[PDB]
Design a protein around this ligand. Structure first.
Ligand SMILES: Nc1nc2c(ncn2[C@@H]2O[C@H](COP(=O)(O)OP(=O)(O)OP(=O)(O)O)[C@@H](O)[C@H]2O)c(=O)[nH]1
Ligand SMILES: Nc1nc2c(ncn2[C@@H]2O[C@H](COP(=O)(O)OP(=O)(O)OP(=O)(O)O)[C@@H](O)[C@H]2O)c(=O)[nH]1
Ligand SMILES: Nc1nc2c(ncn2[C@@H]2O[C@H](COP(=O)(O)OP(=O)(O)O)[C@@H](O)[C@H]2O)c(=O)[nH]1
Ligand SMILES: Nc1nc2c(ncn2[C@@H]2O[C@H](COP(=O)(O)OP(=O)(O)O)[C@@H](O)[C@H]2O)c(=O)[nH]1
Ligand SMILES: [Mg+2]
Ligand SMILES: [Mg+2]
Lengths: 43, 28, 134, 427, 445, 99, 50, 54, 217, 429
């Protein structure tokens, strides 16, 4: 909950999986957009 | 004692006091 | 200076008018804070930080200034003393903030390591033979 | 009241706008769901500059997200603040431009410019009084450098008398990222010269120098660089959304900092940047902010002010300060360094002061500097362009989409003319 | 019977009014709701508020002011501040987009769509007044709506209300300190309005009030609020005779009678005499001679000019508080002896006095001490030309290479405005030096 | 046609000073006849020798007899050690050293 | 730099000559605040009136 | 027409108001000192937490 | 109506005027804070209508270390906060410095306060200037101050109480230059000059008074 | 406020300045964290002379630390008093000068001057009324000699009106540490007469002499010599920081001491020096203090003033005292040995008195004296230089950096001109 200043962003060091999920997509020529039920890495 | 410094504030020959030591105080 | 036993009214000490020195406002390095105190928590408004200032302090400061500095009249005296209810909110585990944090950080680096991306202060450049920045 | 329709095109534009909207939502007090969880009344008084009132007591951003390939939109949608953007604003194609300006401007951007113009025509006409547009993109990529300039060329026809800003990332001196980057840079500068009212040039190793020397960051990700660009991006419009003793919008800065209509390439800055272990060794105070404002180790473009003459300088302040101290500091800096300011303008500093500082900070400031030292960047890009174009190095990847070489010749002629015209005011 | 309608244009005008009207609401017994708890006044005749206030049907007092700005970021502070219920909601006009430091925008593009509502409110304010003495315009020269829209407002007011008096308390660009770059253009182009459509124009330098605040008061690092309090005290002193009782009352027409020698010379200088803190009022007294001598010092002046190099053409002294006319006469007889204050030859008297019995009122959290006496010298001097001489150089330097004119000509302004305004200011310089030359012979041998 | 023709405004000149031979009721007619013989002025209108910190310069003694009056100017050589001007010897010493 | 060196005496001497001449110009005119003028210095005087 | 001037008690009241203003100046100086100390302590707290995380 | 403005220039002037005003406050009825615990005080002290008496003096010095003790110690309440005029640097034992370079930007403030003191004066008898020849501001700024005081006020008597350089002892090396150059100017702008010597007072304090080891006080 | 910007340079400069900042923080009551804990209110109003204002009531010293290797920087940063200094003020390089004047002045040291200049301009524009600078270095090194002189000759023309002091440590005649040191000594002395206002000559074996006979110190490490240097380093600027009966700043000791613009080499001294065994067997009086100041065993340069003539003598006294038994004693010492004072100046004595003594001492006094006996240091350095240069002993370590070989010749010529100028002004009647 520290204040958001340009020196307080950090990396998640204990993170192994980095898979993305195609939330954007096409079904029948229509630009479909679905809700993200999962983050980056399967979380 | 803070009670002493409030009773002794208005002691004198021509001084009117309303505070009372150990009891009810006057309505004025 | 607001504490005096002989000027106690209704259980609260008050400051008389004869103890105010006119030269005290032009004294920057006499009434000053030296060390202060840290807290091992996140920043914010809390109950253990001493000079913590909420939005209820500035309203009180504007109110007291518009209340005529809390005068106390007396018999045969128009204004005798100054009420102690106007300076209560400037009156008061925790660690010291002044011990240096750079001693537990990284070592200082030489100047050419610091010049890894854009070069500053090179003798063989244009800007070394121009008037510097003051 | 005064409404900014934020546009972003490309991977750089999307990854900068993600942190930009994070910073704005932190400053206006918006939770990731979209509602308001702040603790002040001033955070809601001018919230329609960046947000839309909608169903739920919640505020959605006015963001138009554009990319030719949805590869990097996947990361921002999976971020902590990816659920605020409306799903209709995501405009995306099927194939990327491949760092080619011609694919992002003639072949693949042409099929996508219809839906983007529909989205911005909807977002721009849901406004009581639209102030102007805002574009974040890059001059090295393919869909940024082509698609964003196509968007500007199509929007300035529809809305000619409005304010266009461009927080472009201009190419970097020492190490590049794209081999064919000088071609894209020249072809995009040729459009931004005639198309943009206010351009902001940001270099990447300038930010690397900031993060390494000023902030002493051992392991900086791109999140910190985007945080710095977002911090100087929100400081330009901070008087539109918050009160102050002296207010200045985008149009006031456009009037004051642009003498002639072809000098609008500014060098941004952010004043209270201090390392972690050097935090308690210095104080936040107006001289010690305006000194770092004018320092050469604080500019976000990789060219020091000493290479040329300062033409006009902005300074937008935030916090509880005295006006006499500010207006004596900006006079003192002009008096001391009399050789680096133009003599034919008696005052080269425009000053505005806001009320609310950023969270956790006493004072903040945003340096915006129009200088004649930015002409040495355009000379560098122009000579790299001539080295590439003399032997027609990568030109078959551009003529293969149906481009004439006279485009390259004219894009370098415009750059050369602007370089020669910046040199006119050096004396 | 003695009403005065205040017009505040621009950011500087609104923030000046935010202190002026607090001072007016404190001089009379007016709570910020709009109430008068006690009808009796300690120095007046139960209607003294009629200069600034008007009664409603609910026992309420409403100011006779119109706040105009082309942006709402400073007027909504008034709409949400402590005095939100004092002002009529219609009395605070606002626009959509400001002129953005452009005289052309506020004079030709943005100001045309809002001037009718402001003139409507001015008409409905002057309908209620049966004894309207004049107007008081508050604006600044270094702005777009303080310089462009104020010019249009005065141009329409002169042709609407005839020869009714009007006064402006303008803010002039300082010689060295500035907050804008394009400021000399706006300050030059607005000279024709304050010369043509005016009766007594006041020029105020922010820098000079900065030296007054840092030197006379113990306030280092002042802000705009401490600057606005002094201007509020001055405008209170210039109108105190239309409200309160005194020995020698002076209205706003005797002002221009005894101060303005020629219709093209209406630029006097303002100074407030006992501007001291409560620290330094403990040692010295505030006798009439002390605060009459202190008014003539160059450091006490409210513009950056030196009155020793010029010669006074007229002088108007306005006294407040414990002042008996014998003391004013003694002070004037004292200041006629010295060589420094050199008057013009065609003004053997050169003094107009006015005495009011009310001491000036202090505000909570104020800067000035509470005093027994107050003087406000309001005098015209040939030493005011050294501000126009400093402004003409900056305009010539900018326009010689035609720097910022593209923001102006494309916004509807014909580009010949700058040359004509420069020629007007040159003619003013020549006219101001024509009335200062001694009509005497330079001896012989 | 004729207007008062004053001088440069200096210090040390009174705001109003009239010659005391005009306001003397005893010895009045002899003074008027003397002034008529000298041809200075007998009228009452412009009767202020010092007005508005300046000299009258108009109704006097033809402005050349007035200037050519008194002892001639003294050579700046040295003050004796009794003259009241001996405080200013230090500037005469410096001026003699200058040449 | 030698041409710079020899100039300083002439500039300083001009400044001092200007200062002394300003002061004697102020001495020709009377003191400020003529109430400080003693009676032997007014042009009126007791001696000149008779 | 015939007002002599303010009596003694009015001038005494003006002097008392001046003394009150002096007291208020003292209080506000203490106010600004405590504000500056507060925000110094805030900045140092944030820096120490960041060092711990590093 | 018999008032005498005192001027104290330099460290010697300030350290003389401290004892002078202590004696003046004791001789009349003036408390150290300027109050009363019979018109003899009007020569040296002014009047305010609240019971406060303000001295008719100016303490002018270029170095700040000497005057800052006055506005800190016992008699800090007595003097006006402005009447203690103070510069930034000093003349540094240089008549040329305090007369041409540093003393020029200070003399306007001293002249203005002297004018404001004389505005309170209706029967001004004269001035009293205390300085020393061997210093820089006591020789440079004192000469310039009297030199423009003569043009400001004219024939008003200005009395000098100057610390002449001693024959045998000396505190400086460059003091013959200053003492040569200031007597070239204290000849036409000083009606009288009472001279004192430090070592003669040392011998007086040793022999007549019992005090061996005497300070400057 | 008259504030001094302190400039350390090299290993000697850093080792002296660490102890100097220690004694300054001792006098003003500053803890290593940087706060104030003094027992008196007289220690705070004149703290802006040496201490800048940081956040939270923290006082940071006005020092920039310069070195060409990170060996001494890291040691002084890890010392007990190393945490007061600003982290950005540590500017050092990778490759040292290697005891070469030419590397420190022309090739390696020129790389670093543009960052020390940045820190100096950073620090001097924050001054309200800057009084002057202060440099500590040694003339027998490579970055104390070359880089320090480049700093001297590069900050002088930017700020051409301030007061510049150098506490230089010129090479000892007898004890030696560096073979190549006559070259550096000559090439720095030739440059030290154009861009300085005051120069304080200190010999290491003179301080060893003080420790071995006056102090009776038996194993004097470098810290004791650093305290001996720093006590008189703080005894000159003491009148700015504390009140007194007779104040004198650096400039008051500059106008009163140097007669001509090329005679500014003094020999410092410190009066109340005694062993620990003789602590209680001494009455701290002025006749016991001036007698030790003018003693020939007290000066910190190994040049006996009995071989020359005292051009000017300055003395700064500290502690509560009067002004009779100061001036009578200085008259007595002017009249007793009058053969050692020049007759063409009748009063050769400058005297200042401050009444705030150092802690643990009732009275103290600092000697600054300009003597023409300093020519025997210069001529003997020149003799050891010309015993080396005629055979071109180590010239390839200097010629190989682009330095023209005539520079040694003009440096020797200017040194000889200095010696002859001091010789003419001695017997001058
Ligand atoms: N004394 C004083 N001057 C002010 C104040 N506010 C603004 N100013 C002056 O006004 C100028 C700012 O421009 P303004 O004229 O106020 O701008 P504006 O009237 O709102 O016109 P636009 O900004 O174009 O809408 C500055 O140069 C200030 O000197 C104030 O509160 N007090
Ligand atoms: N009688 C007497 N003489 C003093 C006193 N204080 C200083 N002096 C004299 O002053 C001389 C020293 O020079 P100062 O007068 O202090 O110099 P200054 O006036 O401060 O001007 P600067 O030289 O620029 O500092 C000594 O020779 C003393 O004779 C004092 O208290 N009493
Ligand atoms: N400074 C900075 N540059 C970026 C960032 N993201 C992408 N870039 C730049 O983007 C360029 C690469 O092209 P890119 O924009 O990814 O291709 P595009 O998406 O097809 O337009 C390079 O010049 C990088 O400097 C960022 O977060 N910060
Ligand atoms: N007198 C004295 N000399 C020292 C001290 N520290 C180092 N030195 C001397 O410095 C001389 C060499 O200086 P050096 O370290 O090479 O300077 P550098 O160029 O910075 O490395 C030697 O003669 C040492 O005796 C000290 O604390 N006191
Ligand atoms: Mg505005
Ligand atoms: Mg002195």
């Amino acid at each position: 909950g520290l204040p958001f200043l340009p020196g307080t962003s950090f990396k998640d060091l204990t993170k192994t999986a980095f898979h993305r999920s195609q939330t954007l997509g096409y079904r029948n020529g229509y630009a479909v957009v679905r809700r993200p039920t999962v983050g980056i890495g399967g979380d | 004692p803070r009670k002493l410094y409030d009773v002794a504030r208005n002691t004198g020959a021509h001084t009117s006091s309303g505070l009372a030591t150990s009891g009810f105080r006057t309505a004025k | 200076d607001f504490d005096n036993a002989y000027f106690t009214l209704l259980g609260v000490p008050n400051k008389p008018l004869q103890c105010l020195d006119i030269t005290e406002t032009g004294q920057r390095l006499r009434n000053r804070y030296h060390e202060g105190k840290l807290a091992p928590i996140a920043p914010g408004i809390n109950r253990v930080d001493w000079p913590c200032f909420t939005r209820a302090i500035e309203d009180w400061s504007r109110f007291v200034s518009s209340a005529g500095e809390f005068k106390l009249p007396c018999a045969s005296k128009k204004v005798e003393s100054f009420s102690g209810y106007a300076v209560r909110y400037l009156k008061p585990f925790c660690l010291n903030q002044n011990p240096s944090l750079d001693r537990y950080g990284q070592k200082p680096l030489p100047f050419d390591s610091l010049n890894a991306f854009r070069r500053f202060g090179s003798n063989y450049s244009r800007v070394n033979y121009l008037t510097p920045w003051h | 009241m005064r409404e900014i329709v934020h546009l972003q095109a490309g991977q750089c534009g999307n990854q900068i706008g993600a942190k930009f909207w994070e910073v704005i939502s932190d400053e206006h007090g918006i939770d990731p769901t979209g509602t308001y969880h702040g603790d002040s009344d001033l955070q809601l008084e001018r919230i329609n500059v960046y947000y839309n009132e909608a169903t739920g007591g919640k505020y959605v951003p006015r963001a138009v997200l554009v990319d030719l390939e949805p590869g990097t939109m996947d990361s921002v949608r999976s971020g902590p603040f990816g659920q605020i953007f409306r799903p209709d604003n995501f405009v995306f194609g099927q194939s990327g431009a491949g760092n080619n300006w011609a694919k992002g401007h003639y072949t693949e951007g042409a099929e996508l410019v219809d839906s983007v113009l529909d989205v911005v025509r909807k977002e721009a006409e849901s406004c009581d009084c639209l102030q102007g547009f805002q574009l974040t993109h890059s001059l090295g990529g393919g869909t940024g450098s082509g698609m964003g300039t196509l968007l500007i060329s199509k929007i300035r026809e529809e809305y000619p008398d409005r304010i266009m800003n461009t927080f472009s990332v201009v190419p970097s001196p020492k190490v590049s990222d794209t081999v064919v980057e000088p071609y894209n840079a020249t072809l995009s500068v040729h459009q931004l010269v005639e198309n943009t009212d206010e351009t902001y040039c940001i270099d990447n190793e300038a930010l690397y120098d900031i993060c390494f020397r000023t902030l002493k960051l051992t392991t900086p990700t791109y999140g910190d660089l985007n945080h710095l660009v977002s911090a100087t991006m929100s400081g330009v419009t901070t008087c539109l959304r918050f009160p102050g003793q002296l207010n200045a919008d985008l149009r006031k800065l456009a009037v004051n900092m642009v003498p002639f209509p072809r000098l609008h390439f500014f060098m941004p800055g952010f004043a209270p940047l201090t390392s972690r272990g050097s935090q308690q060794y210095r104080a936040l105070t107006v001289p010690e902010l305006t000194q770092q404002m004018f320092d050469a180790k604080n500019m976000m473009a990789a060219c020091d002010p000493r290479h040329g003459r300062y033409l006009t300088v902005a300074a937008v302040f935030r916090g509880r300060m005295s006006m006499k101290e500010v207006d004596e500091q900006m006079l003192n800096v002009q008096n001391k360094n009399s050789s680096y300011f133009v003599e034919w303008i008696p005052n080269n500093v425009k000053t505005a002061v806001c009320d609310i500082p950023p969270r956790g900070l006493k004072m903040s400031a945003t340096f915006i500097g129009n200088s004649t030292a930015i002409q040495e960047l355009f000379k560098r890009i122009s000579e790299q362009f001539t080295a590439m174009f003399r032997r027609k190095a990568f030109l078959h990847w551009y003529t293969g989409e149906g481009m004439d070489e006279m485009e390259f010749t004219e894009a370098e002629s415009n750059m050369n003319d602007l370089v020669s015209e910046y040199q006119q005011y050096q004396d | 019977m003695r009403e005065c309608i205040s017009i505040h244009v621009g950011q500087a005008g609104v923030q000046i009014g935010n202190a002026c009207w607090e001072l007016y609401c404190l001089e009379h017994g007016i709570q910020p709701d709009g109430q008068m708890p006690s009808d009796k006044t300690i120095g007046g005749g139960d209607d003294s508020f009629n200069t600034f206030f008007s009664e409603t049907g609910a026992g309420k007092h409403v100011p006779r002011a119109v706040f105009v700005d082309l942006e709402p970021t400073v007027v909504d502070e008034v709409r949400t501040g402590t005095y939100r219920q004092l002002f009529h909601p219609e009395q605070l006009i606002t626009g959509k987009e400001d002129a953005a430091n452009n005289y052309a925008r506020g004079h030709y593009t943005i100001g045309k769509e809002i001037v009718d509502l402001v003139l409507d409110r001015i008409r409905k304010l002057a309908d209620l007044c049966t004894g309207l003495q004049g107007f008081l315009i508050f604006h600044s020269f270094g702005g777009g709506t303080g310089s462009g829209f104020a010019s249009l407002l005065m141009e329409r007011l002169s042709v609407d209300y005839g020869k009714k008096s009007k006064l402006e308390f303008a803010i002039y660009p300082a010689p060295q300190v500035s907050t804008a770059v394009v400021e000399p253009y706006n300050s030059i182009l607005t000279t024709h309005t304050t010369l043509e459509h005016s009766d007594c124009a006041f020029m105020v330098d922010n820098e000079a009030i900065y030296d007054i605040c840092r030197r006379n008061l113990d306030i280092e690092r002042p802000t705009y609020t401490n600057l606005n309090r002094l201007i509020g005290q001055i405008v209170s002193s210039i109108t105190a005779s239309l409200r309160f009782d005194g020995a020698l009352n002076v209205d706003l027409t005797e002002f221009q009678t005894n101060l303005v020698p020629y219709p093209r010379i209406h630029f006097p200088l303002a100074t407030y005499a006992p501007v001291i803190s409560a620290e330094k009022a403990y040692h010295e007294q505030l006798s009439v001679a002390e605060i009459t001598n202190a008014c003539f010092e160059p450091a006490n002046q409210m513009v950056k000019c030196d009155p020793r190099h010029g010669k006074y053409m007229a002088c108007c002294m306005l006294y407040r508080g414990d002042v008996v006319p014998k003391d004013v006469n003694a002070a004037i007889a004292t200041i006629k002896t010295k060589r420094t204050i050199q008057f013009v030859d065609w003004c053997p008297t050169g003094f107009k006095v006015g005495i009011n019995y009310q001491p000036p009122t202090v505000v909570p959290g104020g800067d000035l001490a509470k005093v027994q006496r107050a003087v406000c010298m309001l005098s015209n001097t040939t030493a005011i030309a050294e501000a126009w001489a400093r402004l003409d150089h900056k305009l010539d330097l900018m326009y010689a290479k035609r720097a910022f004119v593209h923001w102006y000509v494309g916004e509807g302004m014909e580009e010949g405005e700058f040359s004509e305004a420069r020629e007007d200011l040159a003619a003013l310089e020549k006219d101001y030096e024509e009335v200062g030359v001694d009509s005497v012979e330079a001896e012989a041998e | 046609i004729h207007l008062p023709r004053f001088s440069l405004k200096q210090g040390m000149i009174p705001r109003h000073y009239v010659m005391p031979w005009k306001q003397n009721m005893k010895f009045r007619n002899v003074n008027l006849k003397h002034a008529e013989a000298c041809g200075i002025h007998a009228g009452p209108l412009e009767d202020s020798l010092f007005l508005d910190h300046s000299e009258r310069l108009c109704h006097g003694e033809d402005r050349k007899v007035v200037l050519k009056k008194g002892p001639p100017e003294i050579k700046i050589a040295d003050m004796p050690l009794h003259s009241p001007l001996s405080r200013y010897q230090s500037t005469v010493i410096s001026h003699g050293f200058r040449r | 730099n030698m041409t710079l060196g020899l100039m300083r005496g002439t500039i300083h001497r001009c400044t001092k000559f200007n200062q002394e001449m300003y002061i004697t110009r102020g001495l020709i005119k009377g003191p400020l605040s003529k109430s400080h003028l003693e009676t032997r210095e007014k042009l009126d005087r007791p001696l000149v009136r008779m | 027409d015939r007002w002599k001037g303010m009596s003694q008690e009015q001038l005494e009241e003006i002097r008392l108001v001046q003394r009150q203003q002096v007291q208020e100046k003292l209080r506000l100086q203490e106010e600004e000192r405590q504000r500056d100390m507060d925000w110094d302590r805030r900045r140092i707290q944030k820096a120490r937490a960041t060092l711990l995380f590093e």
